[PDB]
Nucleic acid binder design. Structure first.
Ligand SMILES: [Mg+2]
Ligand SMILES: [Mg+2]
Ligand SMILES: [Mg+2]
Ligand SMILES: [Mg+2]
Ligand SMILES: [Mg+2]
Ligand SMILES: [Mg+2]
Ligand SMILES: [Mg+2]
Ligand SMILES: [Mg+2]
Ligand SMILES: [Mg+2]
Ligand SMILES: [Mg+2]
Ligand SMILES: [Mg+2]
Ligand SMILES: [Mg+2]
Ligand SMILES: [Mg+2]
Ligand SMILES: [Mg+2]
Ligand SMILES: [Mg+2]
Ligand SMILES: [Mg+2]
Ligand SMILES: [Mg+2]
Ligand SMILES: [Mg+2]
Ligand SMILES: [Mg+2]
Ligand SMILES: [Mg+2]
Ligand SMILES: [Mg+2]
Ligand SMILES: [Mg+2]
Ligand SMILES: [Mg+2]
Ligand SMILES: [Mg+2]
Ligand SMILES: [Mg+2]
Ligand SMILES: [Mg+2]
Ligand SMILES: [Mg+2]
Ligand SMILES: [Mg+2]
Ligand SMILES: [Mg+2]
Ligand SMILES: [Mg+2]
Ligand SMILES: [Mg+2]
Ligand SMILES: [Mg+2]
Ligand SMILES: [Mg+2]
Ligand SMILES: [Mg+2]
Ligand SMILES: [Mg+2]
Ligand SMILES: [Mg+2]
Ligand SMILES: [Mg+2]
Ligand SMILES: [Mg+2]
Ligand SMILES: [Mg+2]
Ligand SMILES: [Mg+2]
Ligand SMILES: [Mg+2]
Ligand SMILES: [Mg+2]
Ligand SMILES: [Mg+2]
Ligand SMILES: [Mg+2]
Ligand SMILES: [Mg+2]
Ligand SMILES: [Mg+2]
Ligand SMILES: [Mg+2]
Ligand SMILES: [Mg+2]
Ligand SMILES: [Mg+2]
Ligand SMILES: [Mg+2]
Ligand SMILES: [Mg+2]
Ligand SMILES: [Mg+2]
Ligand SMILES: [Mg+2]
Ligand SMILES: [Mg+2]
Ligand SMILES: [Mg+2]
Ligand SMILES: [Mg+2]
Ligand SMILES: [Mg+2]
Ligand SMILES: [Mg+2]
Ligand SMILES: [Mg+2]
Ligand SMILES: [Mg+2]
Ligand SMILES: [Mg+2]
Ligand SMILES: [Mg+2]
Ligand SMILES: [Mg+2]
Ligand SMILES: [Mg+2]
Ligand SMILES: [Mg+2]
Ligand SMILES: [Mg+2]
Ligand SMILES: [Mg+2]
Ligand SMILES: [Mg+2]
Ligand SMILES: [Mg+2]
Ligand SMILES: [Mg+2]
Ligand SMILES: [Mg+2]
Ligand SMILES: [Mg+2]
Ligand SMILES: [Mg+2]
Ligand SMILES: [Mg+2]
Ligand SMILES: [Mg+2]
Ligand SMILES: [Mg+2]
Ligand SMILES: [Mg+2]
Ligand SMILES: [Mg+2]
Ligand SMILES: [Mg+2]
Ligand SMILES: [Mg+2]
Ligand SMILES: [Mg+2]
Ligand SMILES: [Mg+2]
Ligand SMILES: [Mg+2]
Lengths: 136, 52, 386
RNA sequence: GUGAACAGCCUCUAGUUGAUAGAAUAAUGUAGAUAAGGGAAGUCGGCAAAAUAGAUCCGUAACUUCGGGAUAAGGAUUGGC
RNA sequence: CUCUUAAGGUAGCCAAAUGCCUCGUCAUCUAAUUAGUGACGCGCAUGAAUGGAUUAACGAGAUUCCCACUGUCCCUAUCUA
RNA sequence: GCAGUCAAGCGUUCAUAGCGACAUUGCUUUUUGAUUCUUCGAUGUCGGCUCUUCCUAUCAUACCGAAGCAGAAUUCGGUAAGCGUUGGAUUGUUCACCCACUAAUAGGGAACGUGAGCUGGGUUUAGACCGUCGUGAGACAGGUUAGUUUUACCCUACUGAUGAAUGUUACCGCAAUAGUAAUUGAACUUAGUACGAGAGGAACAGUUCAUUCGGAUAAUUGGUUUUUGCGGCUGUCUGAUCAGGCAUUGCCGCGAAGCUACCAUCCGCUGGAUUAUGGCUGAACGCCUCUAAGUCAGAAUCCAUGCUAGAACGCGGUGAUUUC
């Protein structure tokens, strides 16, 4: 999470450190999302901040509509490739890393999400959950 | 509790076991272990794998 | 001078010296506060760690994403045959601390226990408690009047119990003997209870119970001499560093001109005494039972031992405690299980659990089958058989 | 023999089997490997490592002293019978 | 037009391995650039075989960035001699 | 660099809520200087990396007092160093400056901590280009490029490991002393409430999670592979086959076991005494006053509980003690 967020994530395995580039699963016109910082993130000497499913990240768009580039913006993680472990006992993992552009309240800039979305993310951000395709 | 089935080896997947893969489209995949997972990532074929 | 950036220190200074324990049996350093109003009780219990397995159960935690849902948890199964009382020891308050005043032993002592007092049993003349028993012979007096003094002195009464190690798949024939504090009412009623339990048996279900949090006192699996990197946690030095990099770089400032008690050095890792608390009891096994591993839901007649036996341990043919998560020490090693030193209302502490399913597949590999019944009821018939 | 080959790898003739030895396999090393997710965020600096690679057939930019640039780049293929 | 010791910086070129001020100003590249490049030039102290400017090809030379690559790192673990 | 005394002024009004001029008393030794006492038969000279510990002039976190404190936010002050104080772009830099996260991104010391610990980017040998200077050889805290980072087996210290002697040998124990640990954020709810004209907008109790740290652990998932365990492949060699050798483990796929990861899972206690402060009763002083006597409440503090070691010259209970 970070805030603007409804509910609470149980901890899930991190896979998207600073510098990770993930796919942009929305119709915003952005193709990349370059993670420059993670919202929750604590501090530890030389730990890269790393996001996981359904966290809010600060990101920049490396590829897409010119208007959408050379600036930082919140994004929300809807898919991660790093396998994580649900309390129901299953280690699952999506096939790529996707994120959706969002404002600080959590409201997507887009209106549609290509790809499936992990439920943990959907439960965190209703507005994400709205425009979502298949969830989990 | 539910037992699943390996979508490669046709094995029984009791809870906690193996891995769950959520492909591009949304087709969910299950492997009881790292072996049938590896064969799947290798693009082998259950129909030609004698123990499946 | 003032480190460029801050970080918390590596390691815990409260678990020093990182030296090898002085007994593979970890010492119960504390017993619960006695409430001398309840029946006479054992406070801890001996047992052998047998291995782990997985569980399934609905969680009861109102206000959680996973409330009224199934979770899968890891558990450890400790092999717990009934223990046997062979004496009681009497401790008196002094301005120098608790003091053992006398110990009184049972008349007949099992071979297992006797073995404990020898280094070379086989070539011994086994004279272990041979003269002591005579104290009983003369109708009483001797013994009779030592119990007498534990009664009038002694602020605390411990029993001497020992494991029946032979019920265990363990090869070790020598048994384990430990003092266990009695926590039922009145000194007198305590030594009475001990007296009456001489040579007799005590089982777990008479001490522990389901949903109860208990502590686990054992000696950590050893690893011998360890470098600083793994022993303390310490960052790895860069690739380019000459003379090795699994070190720490600055063992100290110039002043104090002494390597200090608080910096990481290589040495022993493992084989330490740990007192791990708040492990919740998910199952009290009955040895006579043949549905040890069964459930109100999963009705099938199976015992707790996984297919192929607990790896490096064997089968559980005895009573057992099955506890949530993990406990210190490794398979085959003696554990003390102590009941909590406090009354935790954690709500997590208070949750009553009902197991729905107990994993009983093989652990010696990527197991696929719970019962050989099930295996064959899937594989078909093989080249052997029929 | 393989192969473009006095390459590498295996062999025949000939020649050696000589470099203190035994028991263990802690830390730390020297030398050789691998690593989920991320992918230079490490660092003075991609140092070190990794990646590419043979051959056949397609394809190939700016620029240029018109000779080059050029294996530019970018693709497909490759066994056995 | 003028002062001065013979004259008084042309053609070019540039914060360049030559610029003090200086981390120059503008533009560009980045989330962010004492870095890089393109430009500007009263240029402390550029400048014409004390060679100036251009320049294809070439370089175990100095430097910037991209793609690929990866245990350099996040953050360590494991194996062999 | 930091802190005071004065109180002209600022602060609608009002010196002192928060500030404070003209003057003036101090403190500090991470600045720079001044000196030249120590080292020139030699104390390795910047930065960073790594790690420990200390100071407090406190940035965060606990509890308070104050306000020009309505609420929210903030600011001033007390007890407080128990606990934390980060990820990056440019630079050899310390410094600086931006982006970004955050509860907060406090300032310092430890031979300007730390080179038989690293690194060697800068600096400052010898090669070389420029520019300024010089007739020249050459010079230049001007720019630039390339430039060997040695030894520990000794003592001590630190980490772990044995161990003679107290009749012998064994078992169970005591606890002096020493160490000691947890940390921080959010959501829900309280509540669109208290307060407020509006804008806005809290907290205690309760619930769920998370950050950082610590200790274990290996059911599970993942990593590792000389299980050279099974299979596949290239070259060659054993006449063929079968089955094998050699290719410094020939290659590739899977691969149990062990080891192992916020890449995995579990676990991380509760009593007291205080501090600031606010009070009680109460004189001094027939009033008044938290204080003088006495005394209540009270903090991330302290002391215990708990947790680690167990004094090898601290101790207790108990068993057996020789025909070769
Ligand atoms: Mg760093
Ligand atoms: Mg800009
Ligand atoms: Mg595996
Ligand atoms: Mg500091
Ligand atoms: Mg180590
Ligand atoms: Mg070196
Ligand atoms: Mg296993
Ligand atoms: Mg010869
Ligand atoms: Mg030799
Ligand atoms: Mg290998
Ligand atoms: Mg990797
Ligand atoms: Mg990539
Ligand atoms: Mg850096
Ligand atoms: Mg960098
Ligand atoms: Mg450089
Ligand atoms: Mg360089
Ligand atoms: Mg290289
Ligand atoms: Mg590699
Ligand atoms: Mg590879
Ligand atoms: Mg041409
Ligand atoms: Mg073909
Ligand atoms: Mg003149
Ligand atoms: Mg002219
Ligand atoms: Mg001319
Ligand atoms: Mg110029
Ligand atoms: Mg030029
Ligand atoms: Mg320059
Ligand atoms: Mg860039
Ligand atoms: Mg750069
Ligand atoms: Mg330029
Ligand atoms: Mg010139
Ligand atoms: Mg000339
Ligand atoms: Mg010319
Ligand atoms: Mg060259
Ligand atoms: Mg006023
Ligand atoms: Mg006034
Ligand atoms: Mg003011
Ligand atoms: Mg001097
Ligand atoms: Mg000298
Ligand atoms: Mg010295
Ligand atoms: Mg030297
Ligand atoms: Mg203070
Ligand atoms: Mg106060
Ligand atoms: Mg006022
Ligand atoms: Mg106000
Ligand atoms: Mg507000
Ligand atoms: Mg405010
Ligand atoms: Mg002040
Ligand atoms: Mg401290
Ligand atoms: Mg941070
Ligand atoms: Mg100093
Ligand atoms: Mg120094
Ligand atoms: Mg030194
Ligand atoms: Mg050195
Ligand atoms: Mg140097
Ligand atoms: Mg240098
Ligand atoms: Mg030189
Ligand atoms: Mg240089
Ligand atoms: Mg060189
Ligand atoms: Mg020496
Ligand atoms: Mg004697
Ligand atoms: Mg509401
Ligand atoms: Mg108002
Ligand atoms: Mg709030
Ligand atoms: Mg660990
Ligand atoms: Mg295992
Ligand atoms: Mg033959
Ligand atoms: Mg045949
Ligand atoms: Mg041979
Ligand atoms: Mg050879
Ligand atoms: Mg081989
Ligand atoms: Mg008072
Ligand atoms: Mg008083
Ligand atoms: Mg007074
Ligand atoms: Mg009173
Ligand atoms: Mg009091
Ligand atoms: Mg505390
Ligand atoms: Mg504790
Ligand atoms: Mg002891
Ligand atoms: Mg002793
Ligand atoms: Mg000694
Ligand atoms: Mg003794
Ligand atoms: Mg005796």
């Amino acid at each position: 999470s970070g805030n603007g967020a409804q509910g609470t994530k149980f901890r899930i395995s991190l896979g998207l450190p600073v510098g990770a580039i993930m796919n942009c699963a929305d119709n915003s016109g952005a193709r990349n999302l370059y993670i420059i910082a993670v919202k929750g993130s604590g501090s530890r000497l030389n730990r890269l901040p790393a996001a996981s499913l359904g966290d809010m990240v600060m990101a920049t768009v490396k590829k897409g509509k010119p208007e959408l580039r050379k600036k930082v913006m919140p994004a929300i993680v809807v898919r991660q490739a790093k396998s994580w472990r649900r309390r129901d006992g299953v280690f699952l993992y999506f096939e790529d890393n996707a994120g959706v552009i969002a404002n600080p309240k959590g409201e997507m800039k887009g209106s549609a999400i290509t790809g499936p979305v992990g439920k943990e993310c959907a439960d965190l951000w209703p507005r994400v959950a709205s425009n979502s395709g298949v969830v989990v | 509790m539910k037992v699943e089935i390996d979508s490669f080896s046709g094995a029984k997947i009791y809870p906690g076991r193996g891995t769950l893969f959520v492909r591009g489209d949304s087709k969910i995949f299950r492997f009881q272990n790292s072996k049938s997972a590896s064969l799947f990532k290798q693009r082998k074929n259950p129909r030609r794998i004698a123990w499946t | 001078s003032h480190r460029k950036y801050e970080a918390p220190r590596h390691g815990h200074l409260g678990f020093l010296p990182r030296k090898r324990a002085a007994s593979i049996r970890a010492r119960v350093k504390a017993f619960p506060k006695d409430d001398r109003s309840k029946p006479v009780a054992l406070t801890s219990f001996l047992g052998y760690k047998a291995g782990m397995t997985t569980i399934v159960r609905d969680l009861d935690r109102p206000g959680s994403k996973f409330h009224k849902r199934e979770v899968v948890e890891a558990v450890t199964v400790v092999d717990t045959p009934p223990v046997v009382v062979v004496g009681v020891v009497g401790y008196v308050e002094t301005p120098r601390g608790l003091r053992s005043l006398t110990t009184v032993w049972a008349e007949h002592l099992s071979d297992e226990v006797k073995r404990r007092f020898y280094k070379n049993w086989y070539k011994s003349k086994k004279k272990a408690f041979t003269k002591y028993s005579a104290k009983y012979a003369q109708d009483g007096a001797g013994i009779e009047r030592e119990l007498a003094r534990i009664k009038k002195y002694a602020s605390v009464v411990r029993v001497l119990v020992h494991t029946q190690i032979r019920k265990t798949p363990l090869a070790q024939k020598k048994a384990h003997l430990a003092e266990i504090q009695l926590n039922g009412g009145s000194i007198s009623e305590k030594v009475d209870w001990a007296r009456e339990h001489f040579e007799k048996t005590v089982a777990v279900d008479s001490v522990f119970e389901q949903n109860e949090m208990i502590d686990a006192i054992a000696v950590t699996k050893g690893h011998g001499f360890e470098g600083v990197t793994h022993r303390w946690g310490t960052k790895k030095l860069p690739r380019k560093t000459h003379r090795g990099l699994r070190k720490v770089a600055c063992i100290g400032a110039w002043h104090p001109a002494h390597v200090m008690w608080s910096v990481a050095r290589a040495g022993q890792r493992g084989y330490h005494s740990r007192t791990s608390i708040n492990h919740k009891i998910y199952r009290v096994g009955k040895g006579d039972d043949e549905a040890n591993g069964a459930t109100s839901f999963d009705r099938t007649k199976k015992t707790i031992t996984p297919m192929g036996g607990f790896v490096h341990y064997g089968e559980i043919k005895n009573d057992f405690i099955m506890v949530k998560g993990c406990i210190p020490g490794n398979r085959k090693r003696i554990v003390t299980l102590r009941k909590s030193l406090y009354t935790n209302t954690s709500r997590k502490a208070l949750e009553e659990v009902s197991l729905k399913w107990i994993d009983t597949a093989s652990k010696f590999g990527k197991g696929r089958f719970q019962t050989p019944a099930e295996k064959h009821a899937f594989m078909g018939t093989l080249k052997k058989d029929l």
